[PDB]
Each structure stands twice: as structure tokens, then as C-alpha cells.
Amino acid sequence: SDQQLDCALDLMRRLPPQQIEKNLSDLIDLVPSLCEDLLSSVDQPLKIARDKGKDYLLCDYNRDGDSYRSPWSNKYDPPLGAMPSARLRKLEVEANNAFDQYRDLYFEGGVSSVYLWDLDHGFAGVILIKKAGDGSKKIKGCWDSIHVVEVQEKSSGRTAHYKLTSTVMLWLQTNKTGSGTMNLGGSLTRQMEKDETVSDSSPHIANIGRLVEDMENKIRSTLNEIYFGKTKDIVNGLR
Amino acid sequence: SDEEKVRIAAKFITHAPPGEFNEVFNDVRLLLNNDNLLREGAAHAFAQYNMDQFTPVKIEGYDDQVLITEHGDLGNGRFLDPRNKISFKFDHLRKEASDPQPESALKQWRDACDSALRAYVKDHYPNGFCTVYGKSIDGQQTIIACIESHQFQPKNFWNGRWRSEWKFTITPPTAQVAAVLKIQVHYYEDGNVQLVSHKDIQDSVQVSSDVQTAKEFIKIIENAENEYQTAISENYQTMSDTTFKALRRQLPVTRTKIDWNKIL
């Protein structure tokens, strides 16, 4: 079914991007063979859970079984589990506290979550940021960003190699008198590969955050052009 | 289950982007893997997509393209071309027309509104098509104007389509107007983004003669579809400097990038 999954992914790229949850569920009920292969390949909106006391975001890299581990309490909400090493868990808390400020400085709200896992010659992490514009009938929107970084140490540890892969899902809806209902939905994916020095004045998190910030500033610029420029010109070309 | 796999397959075909029906049909065919379940189960879905998208079709020897709409459905697999009073077979899969045959009470107003609408569509749309219907709905005389305009450029990785449906319910001396305008754009050159926009319109107009009411109908269509397009461009700008910023800013409030070792 290698050509079956191809048509399944080609279908999700063409369907209305604000119905991925039900389409992917209908798509799995249609062909349950690729149930696991699709979920690990289809970009889905980030889901929110409660630590029970901040919110935290759910993904596959912080999941073990049918339970989800909180980045604050370090315990799975469905009690168990795969835990980070004591040295990595300490670096993970610094990462959550660093990207919690990054979330506030650039989004002024929303939820953020960082999860790390040890590989072999380094560690890899996921940065999850979720910003929703609720509480208004006329103006709505949401922003989901998923960053996966791979850190590779080089000998003495003065320089390391980083590999970044980011996806930003953007939705907007307006209900105005003149333009009626306008709905914009979609996403954008970028990859990165670079190495920077690792001194005491610039640790790993200072390098990872410096690459997430520059990436999201680049993605935002492209999103502003394809959302409010490219699609605008296509509309004016229809009339 | 096997009544549920065609229900899922029909829904996927219903929500195909303009100009991407063929690519969605293949993905659905290779996924369902039951070509006879797809042809008789999702037959209504192929007809539903074409009728909802106002698909223009070229009939041999009749030059003017006609839109496939629910108002043109004659209830026997055929569709009506009110301009050249004929009916024809339409194959919703190949999008082909065949078997033409000739095809009442509100015929003069339809001819008038059509003549006025064709010049309007030519003055405002590049590759635009239109079709005006005259019929009775629940004992009420109704005039239905439909407009379609699309640009299919898969080589440039984008497609778009404009749709307009204007319903004028004649109740002398008035006519209740109910309209819907629809735009759908898919752009996948870099990234992937889809626009879905609609607007509902309710208005009133006093009827007179078949000609004075026709030009008064087109006037309402012209003023409303001008405001719709202009307000969309003004809203695009608002979403650029405001609604997007309310999600994520370009720079922090301090207007300087983050000092990352001042956080740790």
C-alpha cells in the first residue's frame, strides 16, 4: 500500500485545511491500513491538555502509550513511562522557561511546551507554540508552530551542529459586512542546518532559541505574502 | 461499512478545490479500490460538485457556454440551456455535453435579464460565463442569475474560482432579492493556503417593464459585487497589519530582537 499512502497524503494537501481532524478520521475509517503511517505524516492542529496548573501541548514526542507527559510536572496525566534523563530533564526545564518568555515576547499569550529526548551522540527536542484568537464572533484565528531540532556535539563541545525543521499552521477568519466571511487556512514547512559555537555565554538553548526566532520571523514574512498578497492577486484576477 | 466508505468518498469529492477535481477523484479511486461502488454510490457526488461549482460546458454548435447548476437540472439527467432553448445530456465525469433537444411563462424577462447580464459579465470578468433561469418556485415567479469565473494554473501551482447566484422573487410591484457570492482560491507554489469566502445579500427592488426591471437587476448585481471585491482587498490589508499581528508580532513590544543570554 505504498501508493495508497501517497494518494492519502495527496488528498490531505488538497482538502480544506480547517477540517483536517474529521477528514483524517474519515480517511482512516476509509483505509485503516495506513492509520499509523498517516498520523505521523499529516500536519494536525496542536491539542491542549491541563497539568491539573498550566496548560501544555500534546504531540507524539512526549507520548508513551495512551498517556501524555507534562513538561511542568514531569508526570503523565494518565498515570504510568518514558522519562528524560536527570541531566536532560534539567536542560528541558531551562528550555521551557526560555521559550515561555519567547512565547510572551512574540505572541503575548497562548501556550508553549518543550520536550527533549536523548539520542546517542546528542539530543533532539520539540518546541510547541499554540496561539488561538478566541472570544470574538467577527474576528477569529489560530497559530500553531512545530519545531524539531537535532543537536550534534563536535569533539570538545565548543561547537555543535543543529538541524531544525519547523512547520507553522495559520488560520484566520473574519465576519464583516463588506467582505462577508473570509477564511484563510494552510501551513508552511522549512528546514535548517547550521553549526554555531557553544560557549558558556551561549549554551545550547541560546543557540536553539536563536534559530527558532530567526526561522519564525522568516516564516511569518512568507506567510504574510502568500496569505494576504498572493491570494489577493488571484481574487482580483478572477474579476 | 460499505455504505460508509462511499459516504466518506463522496464527501471528499464534494470538497475538492476548483480545478483539482481530477486529482481528488484519482486519490479517492485508488483509496476506495472499488470502482463499481464509486460509480453508482458517488454518482450523485460528481453531479453535486459540478452543480455547486457552476461548471461551464461547451456544447457543439451553440458557442455560448452554459453553467451546470441546480436550476438547470431538469430531473432526467439532462440540463437546460435557457439561452438557446435546448436540453442536453451531461456526463459529470468527462464533463461532456451530448444529445441536444429543444426545450416558458416568464420567458421574456429571462431573455431581457440575460441580455443585460452578458454585457455586465463581459465588462467585469476576463473569462466569465453566465446563465439566467426563469421558473416558478412554490407558486412564485423567480428569476435566477448565475455567474462563474475561474483561473486554473496548475503549472503556476494555484487555482481560483468566482461564483454568483442572484434570485429575484417577483411579487408585484416588488421583487425580493437573495444572493450569494463565493470565492475559493488554492495556492501551493510555496507552502499551502486556501481561501474560502462567501457573502449573503438580501435586497428589494420595484419591478416595472421587462427591460426596466432587467437593467435595475443588473444594477444591484454590479453595485454589490463591486463592494464585495473592494471590501475584500481592504480586509486583506486589515488582516496584514492587525489580525496577523494579534497572533504573532513581527517584533516584540520593545521593537528589538531577543537577547538570548539575558534570559538564561
Place this chain on the structure above:
Amino acid sequence: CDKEFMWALKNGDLDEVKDYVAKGEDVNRTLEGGRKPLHYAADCGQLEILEFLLLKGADINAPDKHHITPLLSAVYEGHVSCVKLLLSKGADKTVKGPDGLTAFEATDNQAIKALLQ
């Protein structure tokens, strides 16, 4: 519930901003984000939201957690008509921002500099 009030302030949904304040909310309370309702409106150039918050009794000179006045916020983001209203309603243009500069010294906008004279 603080974020949804912040969302209405930024996008200028006057009806939602009106209900929140009518329900008994404080137009001068700093939201959890770190700014007062005047800041979020002036930061996004919401002239109609500023007029409502002002006649509802908001402090036109109160700073946020960035030490930025509502006048300075509109000046930083280049909202000309918002600077015009705030000055007409009595905003103190002599207050220095976190960089020690007044509004006149902190912008190269000639239109805004003309208003600040």
C-alpha cells in the same frame, strides 16, 4: 478570559470590548499579558477602541510592564491618527520611555513628529 479581552482589544471588536467593561471590568487593570487595555489598542492603531476606553475613565499616561505609555505605544508602531487623538485628549508627551527618550525623540515619522510639536 483575559486573553479573549486582549483579542477583542487588538482587533477592535468594539461590541465585545463594550460588554467586558459593562460586566464590571476595570479599564485600568493590567492584563496578565502585562499591558493595560489602552496599550493593546494603541499598539494596534485602534482609534475607536481608544476613544471608548478614554471616555470610560482610563489613565491616558499609565505605563505597562515595558514602561511604555499609550502615546509612546502608538508612536513606536507608527499610528498617526492614534497619536492625534491621544494628544488631543491630554496625553503627556514629556514622559520618557524605557530608553530615556520622549516621543518626539524616539521616532523618525515626520507626520508623528509634526503632531508632537
